[PDB]
Amino acid sequence: NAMVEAIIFDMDGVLFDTEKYYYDRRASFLGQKGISIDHLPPSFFIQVWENILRDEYDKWDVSTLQEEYNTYKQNNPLPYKELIFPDVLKVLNEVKSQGLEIGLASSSVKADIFRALEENRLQGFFDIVLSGEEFKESKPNPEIYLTALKQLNVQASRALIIEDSEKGIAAGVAADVEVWAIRDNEFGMDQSAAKGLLDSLTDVLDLI
Amino acid sequence: MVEAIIFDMDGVLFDTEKYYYDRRASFLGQKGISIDHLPPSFFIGGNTKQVWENILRDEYDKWDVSTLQEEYNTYKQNNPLPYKELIFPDVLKVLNEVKSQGLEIGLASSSVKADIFRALEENRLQGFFDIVLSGEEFKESKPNPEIYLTALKQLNVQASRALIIEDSEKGIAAGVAADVEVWAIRDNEFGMDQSAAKGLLDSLTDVLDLI
């Protein structure tokens, strides 16, 4: 019930539906090696080769598995065009029409943020784009969001953050900014710290 | 005494190798084409134009490959890389110093010539290079030495008095096959075998210790 001058969006889980794809990509790689991951549901991932390999741990050169998995991810990049939520461009366009500043904050590496935005005609919507990889700090530390406010030149009280993960929500709130989370109905993410939960990105329009 | 240095472009002057690899891999995914069977060394510094049989394997006969390549070329045009954001922070320092020492300088890349020209113009690098060559201009892809043998001819410098600064397995191989001493920017990302290079470099600044 206050003036909103800027909206800052997280990327994964907010603009792109990524969690299942990440899980399935790992599962596919392991399947190719003959390694089962049935004992670790997606929730487990909400450092872990010993958990993954379980009884088979001593049978594998883990350095080599990591190298092969890395190659697999290079050969199977996240298909951002397929995973974008279908209301993203509509919502961002409307936020922009209303004259609000728009920020993007993401824990993803800059090369991936670049490709996600370019593949989906998104780069023109954002006034400021930040990657967690240029910060010493990681969520739940609020540094990324404090930086976003500074670079957007917007007071915390006049900003809104749209998040999903427990650590991401925590980072936004510790920046003294109102946080709404895209409701997670699948992975058990604890989103109780958010001001409220949104069924989709379209619901963000009701906050401004 | 070194008379000329030939720099490869991607992964040497610009931090573009992830961008380049992910762009191709994304394009292929969009087409429903799997490259799980191929190591990154197969692609990096190579030419997709010539290797569609290796890519498509049993599916090769099912595709209009001419049109597929045209579409990929269009894709690269429509998805330009941000050269101004990716130039390594010591490029101008190094190029000015090499120029000051009176060495000839070449630039070669497997990127199409339009991409190279844009990278040069955008970053004010045009004045450094005696010769600029694209793999687009040659029938034979790296690891074939054609591009580097042509660079030596056009620079009018003998192989024994040249150095090549590379990054990829295929690029190193091309340089060695031209009988030129090659140093490589260390690959900590793609797992490429750079052992054919004379030595590895942590940054472009290390090049200055070679002359």
PDB file of N, CA, C and O in Angstrom, chain A residues 14 17-18 27 30 34 48 63 71 75 78 81 90 94 115 117 124 129 142-143 146 151 160 168 171 179 181 194-195:
ATOM      1  N   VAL A  14      11.659 -17.673 -11.113  1.00  0.00           N
ATOM      2  CA  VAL A  14      10.812 -16.495 -11.174  1.00  0.00           C
ATOM      3  C   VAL A  14      10.479 -16.132 -12.626  1.00  0.00           C
ATOM      4  O   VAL A  14       9.295 -16.002 -12.988  1.00  0.00           O
ATOM      5  N   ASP A  17      11.398 -21.379 -15.420  1.00  0.00           N
ATOM      6  CA  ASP A  17      11.055 -22.538 -14.608  1.00  0.00           C
ATOM      7  C   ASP A  17      12.169 -23.574 -14.751  1.00  0.00           C
ATOM      8  O   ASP A  17      12.153 -24.407 -15.671  1.00  0.00           O
ATOM      9  N   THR A  18      13.113 -23.540 -13.808  1.00  0.00           N
ATOM     10  CA  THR A  18      14.422 -24.170 -14.005  1.00  0.00           C
ATOM     11  C   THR A  18      14.656 -25.393 -13.120  1.00  0.00           C
ATOM     12  O   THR A  18      15.457 -26.242 -13.485  1.00  0.00           O
ATOM     13  N   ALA A  27      20.100 -36.141 -13.596  1.00  0.00           N
ATOM     14  CA  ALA A  27      19.587 -37.510 -13.682  1.00  0.00           C
ATOM     15  C   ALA A  27      19.906 -38.189 -15.019  1.00  0.00           C
ATOM     16  O   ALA A  27      20.263 -39.369 -15.036  1.00  0.00           O
ATOM     17  N   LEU A  30      23.668 -39.060 -15.160  1.00  0.00           N
ATOM     18  CA  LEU A  30      23.895 -40.242 -14.298  1.00  0.00           C
ATOM     19  C   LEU A  30      23.346 -41.520 -14.939  1.00  0.00           C
ATOM     20  O   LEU A  30      24.003 -42.584 -14.926  1.00  0.00           O
ATOM     21  N   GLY A  34      25.006 -45.261 -15.975  1.00  0.00           N
ATOM     22  CA  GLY A  34      24.415 -46.399 -15.281  1.00  0.00           C
ATOM     23  C   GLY A  34      24.259 -46.169 -13.778  1.00  0.00           C
ATOM     24  O   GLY A  34      24.175 -47.139 -13.005  1.00  0.00           O
ATOM     25  N   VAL A  48      28.089 -33.387  -3.268  1.00  0.00           N
ATOM     26  CA  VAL A  48      27.234 -34.501  -2.877  1.00  0.00           C
ATOM     27  C   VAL A  48      27.488 -35.810  -3.633  1.00  0.00           C
ATOM     28  O   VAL A  48      26.593 -36.638  -3.709  1.00  0.00           O
ATOM     29  N   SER A  63      36.629 -37.371  -9.448  1.00  0.00           N
ATOM     30  CA  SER A  63      37.168 -36.258 -10.246  1.00  0.00           C
ATOM     31  C   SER A  63      36.737 -36.404 -11.705  1.00  0.00           C
ATOM     32  O   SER A  63      36.316 -35.432 -12.352  1.00  0.00           O
ATOM     33  N   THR A  71      31.174 -31.526 -18.739  1.00  0.00           N
ATOM     34  CA  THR A  71      31.100 -31.606 -20.207  1.00  0.00           C
ATOM     35  C   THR A  71      29.647 -31.781 -20.642  1.00  0.00           C
ATOM     36  O   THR A  71      29.188 -31.134 -21.588  1.00  0.00           O
ATOM     37  N   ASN A  75      27.336 -29.436 -23.081  1.00  0.00           N
ATOM     38  CA  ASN A  75      26.622 -29.979 -24.236  1.00  0.00           C
ATOM     39  C   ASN A  75      25.108 -29.918 -24.143  1.00  0.00           C
ATOM     40  O   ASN A  75      24.411 -30.103 -25.151  1.00  0.00           O
ATOM     41  N   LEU A  78      20.911 -25.053 -20.398  1.00  0.00           N
ATOM     42  CA  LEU A  78      19.492 -24.817 -20.044  1.00  0.00           C
ATOM     43  C   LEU A  78      18.753 -24.168 -21.225  1.00  0.00           C
ATOM     44  O   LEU A  78      19.230 -23.147 -21.758  1.00  0.00           O
ATOM     45  N   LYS A  81      14.541 -20.624 -23.726  1.00  0.00           N
ATOM     46  CA  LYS A  81      13.362 -20.340 -24.568  1.00  0.00           C
ATOM     47  C   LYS A  81      12.209 -21.268 -24.226  1.00  0.00           C
ATOM     48  O   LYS A  81      11.047 -20.878 -24.318  1.00  0.00           O
ATOM     49  N   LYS A  90       4.989 -10.190 -21.158  1.00  0.00           N
ATOM     50  CA  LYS A  90       3.798  -9.363 -20.920  1.00  0.00           C
ATOM     51  C   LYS A  90       3.925  -8.542 -19.632  1.00  0.00           C
ATOM     52  O   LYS A  90       3.686  -7.318 -19.625  1.00  0.00           O
ATOM     53  N   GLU A  94       4.503  -4.431 -19.244  1.00  0.00           N
ATOM     54  CA  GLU A  94       3.522  -3.623 -18.519  1.00  0.00           C
ATOM     55  C   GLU A  94       4.170  -2.801 -17.377  1.00  0.00           C
ATOM     56  O   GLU A  94       3.863  -1.627 -17.202  1.00  0.00           O
ATOM     57  N   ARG A 115      22.758 -15.094 -21.992  1.00  0.00           N
ATOM     58  CA  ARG A 115      22.098 -15.962 -22.963  1.00  0.00           C
ATOM     59  C   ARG A 115      20.580 -16.024 -22.694  1.00  0.00           C
ATOM     60  O   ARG A 115      19.783 -15.961 -23.640  1.00  0.00           O
ATOM     61  N   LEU A 117      18.615 -13.757 -21.354  1.00  0.00           N
ATOM     62  CA  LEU A 117      17.985 -12.491 -21.784  1.00  0.00           C
ATOM     63  C   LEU A 117      17.970 -12.343 -23.305  1.00  0.00           C
ATOM     64  O   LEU A 117      16.943 -11.966 -23.908  1.00  0.00           O
ATOM     65  N   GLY A 124      16.241  -5.411 -23.029  1.00  0.00           N
ATOM     66  CA  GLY A 124      15.755  -4.046 -23.031  1.00  0.00           C
ATOM     67  C   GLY A 124      14.825  -3.687 -21.885  1.00  0.00           C
ATOM     68  O   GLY A 124      14.527  -2.503 -21.684  1.00  0.00           O
ATOM     69  N   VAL A 129      21.272  -5.110 -14.303  1.00  0.00           N
ATOM     70  CA  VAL A 129      21.364  -6.580 -14.247  1.00  0.00           C
ATOM     71  C   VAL A 129      22.579  -6.957 -13.392  1.00  0.00           C
ATOM     72  O   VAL A 129      23.709  -6.472 -13.646  1.00  0.00           O
ATOM     73  N   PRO A 142      22.288  -9.958   2.083  1.00  0.00           N
ATOM     74  CA  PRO A 142      21.534  -9.030   1.216  1.00  0.00           C
ATOM     75  C   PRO A 142      22.368  -8.193   0.212  1.00  0.00           C
ATOM     76  O   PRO A 142      21.783  -7.346  -0.480  1.00  0.00           O
ATOM     77  N   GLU A 143      23.681  -8.426   0.120  1.00  0.00           N
ATOM     78  CA  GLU A 143      24.570  -7.532  -0.658  1.00  0.00           C
ATOM     79  C   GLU A 143      24.097  -7.327  -2.097  1.00  0.00           C
ATOM     80  O   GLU A 143      24.079  -6.192  -2.578  1.00  0.00           O
ATOM     81  N   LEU A 146      21.127  -4.940  -1.916  1.00  0.00           N
ATOM     82  CA  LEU A 146      21.605  -3.607  -1.520  1.00  0.00           C
ATOM     83  C   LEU A 146      22.296  -2.899  -2.692  1.00  0.00           C
ATOM     84  O   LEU A 146      22.123  -1.686  -2.893  1.00  0.00           O
ATOM     85  N   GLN A 151      22.351   0.973  -7.355  1.00  0.00           N
ATOM     86  CA  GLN A 151      22.515   1.187  -8.804  1.00  0.00           C
ATOM     87  C   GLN A 151      21.228   1.661  -9.492  1.00  0.00           C
ATOM     88  O   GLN A 151      21.284   2.428 -10.471  1.00  0.00           O
ATOM     89  N   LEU A 160      10.342  -3.337  -4.692  1.00  0.00           N
ATOM     90  CA  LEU A 160       9.699  -4.623  -4.483  1.00  0.00           C
ATOM     91  C   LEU A 160      10.625  -5.678  -5.061  1.00  0.00           C
ATOM     92  O   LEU A 160      11.186  -5.475  -6.139  1.00  0.00           O
ATOM     93  N   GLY A 168      16.954 -16.673  -1.027  1.00  0.00           N
ATOM     94  CA  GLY A 168      16.691 -15.464  -1.829  1.00  0.00           C
ATOM     95  C   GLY A 168      15.726 -14.495  -1.151  1.00  0.00           C
ATOM     96  O   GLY A 168      15.974 -13.271  -1.117  1.00  0.00           O
ATOM     97  N   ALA A 171      17.517 -12.780   1.676  1.00  0.00           N
ATOM     98  CA  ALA A 171      18.420 -11.735   1.168  1.00  0.00           C
ATOM     99  C   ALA A 171      17.635 -10.428   0.907  1.00  0.00           C
ATOM    100  O   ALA A 171      18.063  -9.334   1.285  1.00  0.00           O
ATOM    101  N   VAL A 179       9.333  -8.310   0.033  1.00  0.00           N
ATOM    102  CA  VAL A 179       9.552  -9.462  -0.871  1.00  0.00           C
ATOM    103  C   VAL A 179       8.251 -10.256  -1.060  1.00  0.00           C
ATOM    104  O   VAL A 179       7.596 -10.606  -0.077  1.00  0.00           O
ATOM    105  N   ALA A 181       7.003 -13.865  -3.057  1.00  0.00           N
ATOM    106  CA  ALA A 181       7.592 -15.055  -3.655  1.00  0.00           C
ATOM    107  C   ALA A 181       6.621 -15.739  -4.611  1.00  0.00           C
ATOM    108  O   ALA A 181       5.431 -15.839  -4.323  1.00  0.00           O
ATOM    109  N   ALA A 194       8.377 -14.440   3.199  1.00  0.00           N
ATOM    110  CA  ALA A 194       7.881 -13.470   2.205  1.00  0.00           C
ATOM    111  C   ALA A 194       6.681 -12.688   2.744  1.00  0.00           C
ATOM    112  O   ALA A 194       5.941 -13.198   3.602  1.00  0.00           O
ATOM    113  N   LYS A 195       6.487 -11.454   2.265  1.00  0.00           N
ATOM    114  CA  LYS A 195       5.290 -10.668   2.617  1.00  0.00           C
ATOM    115  C   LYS A 195       4.031 -11.421   2.174  1.00  0.00           C
ATOM    116  O   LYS A 195       2.994 -11.443   2.867  1.00  0.00           O
TER     117      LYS A 195
END
